[PDB]
Design a protein around this ligand. Structure first.
Ligand SMILES: Nc1nc2c(ncn2[C@@H]2O[C@H](COP(=O)(O)OP(=O)(O)NP(=O)(O)O)[C@@H](O)[C@H]2O)c(=O)[nH]1
Ligand SMILES: [Cl-]
Ligand SMILES: [Cl-]
Ligand SMILES: [Cl-]
Ligand SMILES: [Cl-]
Ligand SMILES: [Cl-]
Ligand SMILES: [Mg+2]
Ligand SMILES: [Zn+2]
Ligand SMILES: [Zn+2]
Ligand SMILES: [Zn+2]
Lengths: 169, 126
């Protein structure tokens, strides 16, 4: 069975864990419980193929940038998550992208830009801003709500499809 | 103040510790989201094989050490075994309850579902 190594990155509090747990457990984690390191495995049928998704849920902040290097080296595709109600988190996306590109030495790494918390009415990142940034990286942009599950499947399915587009799986 | 904890099926979590927490306390949420129950799991301490621990041990005494959680010995809670299926009788999806012309079915537990309902199938095969 084909295994996919996915990594969820982004600033603290954007909903990386809530997105992953919505995929893994089909439940919305209402509390705030900051992640140090959490990996998950789940089987998912995507385009008629049973896929083993190995998902690494990461910390929003690391004391040393070098602590991310190892899981960026082993990860095959990256969900780069910001929250649409958190302008700083959108501004922080580029640091994750430049670190992943540096560690992989490639401008063609499978990635999806995820704008989460689309249920909240206090939006401050416009969908055109998000599309502009995703276009500048050549990656898809997907709006999600981990609270309602809108777009959660789309984000992970699209990342798997981007991995396949990049390498034989 | 942390402990890295290796979990069944090649998973892991790092849990935060503050004085006044048992092993059951620190790991309850990590097992829950993964479809695992402390009832079917044992917790050990990594040595450099492993050493069995009681689920109510003071987590502060284990800080900086590495732990492992396993299914009950020879009672490994298995993972689903999905197969593509064309349903000849009237079938409905166990997730969305809508009509199921064709889909997938776990050969072990019998869960049947649409492809685009598959992320909602529980992780563990019962
Ligand atoms: N309204 C709403 N709240 C959300 C959504 N996703 C996450 N949250 C909330 O935002 C908070 C942080 O979410 P969480 O998943 O912990 O974020 P994180 O990015 O994993 N944080 P960290 O990096 O520290 O691990 C929680 O209170 C959670 O309930 C969403 O889509 N909508
Ligand atoms: Cl790769
Ligand atoms: Cl907008
Ligand atoms: Cl979706
Ligand atoms: Cl049938
Ligand atoms: Cl069932
Ligand atoms: Mg988190
Ligand atoms: Zn060790
Ligand atoms: Zn099954
Ligand atoms: Zn269905």
């Amino acid at each position: 069975m084909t295994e996919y190594k996915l990594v969820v990155v982004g600033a603290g509090g954007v909903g990386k864990s809530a997105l992953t747990i919505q995929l893994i457990q089909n439940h919305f984690v209402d509390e705030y419980d900051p992640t140090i390191e959490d990996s998950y495995r789940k089987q998912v049928v995507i385009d008629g193929e049973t896929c083993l998704l190995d998902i690494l849920d990461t910390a929003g902040q690391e004391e040393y940038s070098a602590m991310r290097d190892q899981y960026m080296r082993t990860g095959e595709g990256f969900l780069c998550v910001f929250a649409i109600n958190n302008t700083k988190s959108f501004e922080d996306i580029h640091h994750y992208r430049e670190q992943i590109k540096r560690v992989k030495d490639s401008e063609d790494v499978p990635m999806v830009l995820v704008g989460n918390k689309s249920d909240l009415p206090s939006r401050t990142v416009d969908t055109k801003q998000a599309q502009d940034l995703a276009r500048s990286y050549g990656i898809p942009f997907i709006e999600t709500s981990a609270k309602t599950r809108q777009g959660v499947d789309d984000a992970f399915y699209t990342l798997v499809r981007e991995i396949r587009k990049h390498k034989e799986k | 103040n942390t402990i890295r904890v290796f979990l069944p099926n090649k998973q892991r979590t790092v849990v935060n510790v503050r004085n006044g927490m048992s092993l059951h306390d620190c790991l309850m949420k990590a097992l829950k989201v993964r479809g695992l129950q402390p009832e079917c799991c044992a917790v050990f301490r990594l040595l450099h094989k492993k050493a069995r621990l009681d689920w109510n041990t003071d987590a502060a005494s284990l800080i900086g050490e590495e732990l492992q959680v396993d299914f009950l010995d020879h009672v490994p809670l298995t993972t689903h075994n999905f197969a593509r299926k064309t349903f000849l009788k009237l079938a409905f999806c166990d997730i969305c309850q809508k009509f199921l012309l064709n889909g997938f079915r776990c050969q072990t537990c019998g869960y049947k579902f649409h492809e685009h309902c598959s992320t909602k199938v529980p992780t563990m095969c019962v």
